[PDB]
Amino acid sequence: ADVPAGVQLADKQTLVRNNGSEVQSLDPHKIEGVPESNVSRDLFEGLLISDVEGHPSPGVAEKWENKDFKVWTFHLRENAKWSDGTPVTAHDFVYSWQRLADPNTASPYASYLQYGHIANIDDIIAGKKPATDLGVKALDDHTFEVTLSEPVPYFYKLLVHPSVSPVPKSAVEKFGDKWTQPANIVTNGAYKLKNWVVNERIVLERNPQYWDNAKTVINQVTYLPISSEVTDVNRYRSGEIDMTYNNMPIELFQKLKKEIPNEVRVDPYLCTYYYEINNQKAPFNDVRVRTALKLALDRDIIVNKVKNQGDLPAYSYTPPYTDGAKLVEPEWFKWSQQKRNEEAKKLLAEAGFTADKPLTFDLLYNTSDLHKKLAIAVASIWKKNLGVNVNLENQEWKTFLDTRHQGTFDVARAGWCADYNEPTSFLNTMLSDSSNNTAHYKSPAFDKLIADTLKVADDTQRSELYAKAEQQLDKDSAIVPVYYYVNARLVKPWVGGYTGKDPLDNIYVKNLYIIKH
Numbered sequence: 001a002d003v004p005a006g007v008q009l010a011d012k013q014t015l016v017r018n019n020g021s022e023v024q025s026l027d028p029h030k031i032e033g034v035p036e037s038n039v040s041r042d043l044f045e046g047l048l049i050s051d052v053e054g055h056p057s058p059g060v061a062e063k064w065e066n067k068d069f070k071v072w073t074f075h076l077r078e079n080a081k082w083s084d085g086t087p088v089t090a091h092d093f094v095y096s097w098q099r100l101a102d103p104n105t106a107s108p109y110a111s112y113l114q115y116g117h118i119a120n121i122d123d124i125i126a127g128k129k130p131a132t133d134l135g136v137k138a139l140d141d142h143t144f145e146v147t148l149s150e151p152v153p154y155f156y157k158l159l160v161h162p163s164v165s166p167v168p169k170s171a172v173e174k175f176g177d178k179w180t181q182p183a184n185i186v187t188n189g190a191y192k193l194k195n196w197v198v199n200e201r202i203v204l205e206r207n208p209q210y211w212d213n214a215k216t217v218i219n220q221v222t223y224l225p226i227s228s229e230v231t232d233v234n235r236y237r238s239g240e241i242d243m244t245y246n247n248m249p250i251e252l253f254q255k256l257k258k259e260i261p262n263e264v265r266v267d268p269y270l271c272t273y274y275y276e277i278n279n280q281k282a283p284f285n286d287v288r289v290r291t292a293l294k295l296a297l298d299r300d301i302i303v304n305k306v307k308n309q310g311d312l313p314a315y316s317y318t319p320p321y322t323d324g325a326k327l328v329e330p331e332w333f334k335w336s337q338q339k340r341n342e343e344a345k346k347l348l349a350e351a352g353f354t355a356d357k358p359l360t361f362d363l364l365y366n367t368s369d370l371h372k373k374l375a376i377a378v379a380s381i382w383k384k385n386l387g388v389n390v391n392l393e394n395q396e397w398k399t400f401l402d403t404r405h406q407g408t409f410d411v412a413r414a415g416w417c418a419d420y421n422e423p424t425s426f427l428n429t430m431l432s433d434s435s436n437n438t439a440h441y442k443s444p445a446f447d448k449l450i451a452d453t454l455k456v457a458d459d460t461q462r463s464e465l466y467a468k469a470e471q472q473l474d475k476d477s478a479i480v481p482v483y484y485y486v487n488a489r490l491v492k493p494w495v496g497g498y499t500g501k502d503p504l505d506n507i508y509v510k511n512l513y514i515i516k517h
């Protein structure tokens with residue numbers, strides 16, 4: 001943390017953050033979500049990290065070079081250490097990226113290595129080559145070299161993500177799935193795991209072996225798994241929570257804005273809220289049905305009437321303010337809702353649905369006040385506007401993500417937040433073979449457009465192909481865009497160091513501090 005001159009620090013430097021749900025895991029290769037990543041940044045540090053405003057910055061690597069954007073060489077700081085006092089080396093990264101690529105690990109982020117185009121990754125994911133053929137090597141203990149199959153000018157931006165953090169081989173090998181328990185875990189971030197009570201709390205304590213430990217101010221942070229946004233706000237206002245999770249409740253937000261304006265942080269956020277359609281399950285494999293659901297949803301009502309938290313109505317998957325996004329707003333978004341409703345009803349009748357035989361399906365969401373209230377409003381709107389019947393189902397976060405990967409659903413509430421600020425951080429998740437494709441969308445034309453983005457050496461041509469890829473997704477109605485999120489949360493006045501400037505919201509508790517109050 002960088003404490004400003006004259007700030008008086010509190011005697012006790014402890015922090016309580018709500019984290020939205022129980023984490024899937026603490027293993028960097030087994031996670032895919034925001035809650036998971038929130039805890040992961042405090043425990044495991046990759047090559048680069050985000051600074052307090054979100055800029056890619058030195059992590060374990062203190063400096064790096066690239067040759068033609070294809071060979072990237074990272075110089076690891078000599079004092080980087082794990083919490084057991086042993087050095088973090090380039091060998092740790094070689095093992096870790098291999099474990100990520102290895103199909104036996106079944107990481108949800110195995111494709112992150114395809115997004116960066118690390119040599120031989122396609123064959124490794126397919127089982128054609130062993131994970132040891134991955135295009136990474138330790139040139140010495142403090143030098144990690146990555147070789148890509150084509151120039152990727154933004155490659156380094158990918159490296160602040162948890163999937164490319166190191167994991168301790170000896171703990172993984174000796175303890176297997178229990179390597180993340182407090183007694184067994186080894187970590188190289190600013191914190192160490194002290195306690196993990198499932199569905200109660202995760203408690204982290206400062207790691208004295210962290211290379212930049214002298215700048216760490218918070219001594220202990222607790223992450224809570226509260227999925228009720230109303231409850232989160234309640235325990236923040238009671239004094240227990242210092243920073244809520246950034247999912248705000250419809251019940252109280254209007255009131256909070258007027259009651260505690262200075263505590264309500266509302267900043268840009270590169271995330272899109274949408275209804276994910278299972279594209280491989282009839283009748284959702286018919287474009288007419290998917291298009292009807294997309295058009296009959298009234299975003300103005302959801303965004304401005306039912307939620308009204310500053311969100312913008314969405315017409316694409318990639319947020320239009322992503323660095324590199326130059327998207328074409330489709331004609332259907334400019335129409336009136338009445339015109340969208342007629343078009344929707346017309347495609348539905350063409351797909352064989354009648355009043356006698358209506359379209360009935362499930363709408364899966366993860367437990368939450370926000371998601372439930374939004375799903376109830378969406379069910380009503382689709383019933384009223386299009387004649388479809390929806391059966392709402394809630395699941396806890398970890399189960400919900402597994403259900404979407406399994407494909408055991410019809411429509412699911414969904415939200416993707418950028419991992420790096422560039423349109424492919426969204427677009428690559430819709431590739432046919434992406435480990436993150438929970439839409440189960442497979443379009444050879446979409447795949448080709450993205451493939452072509454690294455075959456040109458022009459950002460103008462790249463941006464045009466990204467727009468065309470969004471247009472292909474849209475013409476196929478792969479998803480139902482709802483709104484672009486804003487990052488809205490409550491932060492006590494005494495919590496210093498949270499700028500709200502990073503649109504990826506990659507917060508590190510090592511950057512924060514408690515002002516005397």
Ligand SMILES: [U]
Pocket residue numbers: 011
């Ligand atoms: U004190």
Ligand SMILES: [U]
Pocket residue numbers: none
């Ligand atoms: U106190």
Ligand SMILES: [U]
Pocket residue numbers: 153
């Ligand atoms: U650049």
Ligand SMILES: [U]
Pocket residue numbers: 323
């Ligand atoms: U940029």
Ligand SMILES: [U]
Pocket residue numbers: 361362410
């Ligand atoms: U269903």
Ligand SMILES: [U]
Pocket residue numbers: 230251369
């Ligand atoms: U509620």
Ligand SMILES: [U]
Pocket residue numbers: 153459
């Ligand atoms: U460039």
Ligand SMILES: [U]
Pocket residue numbers: 517
């Ligand atoms: U106090």
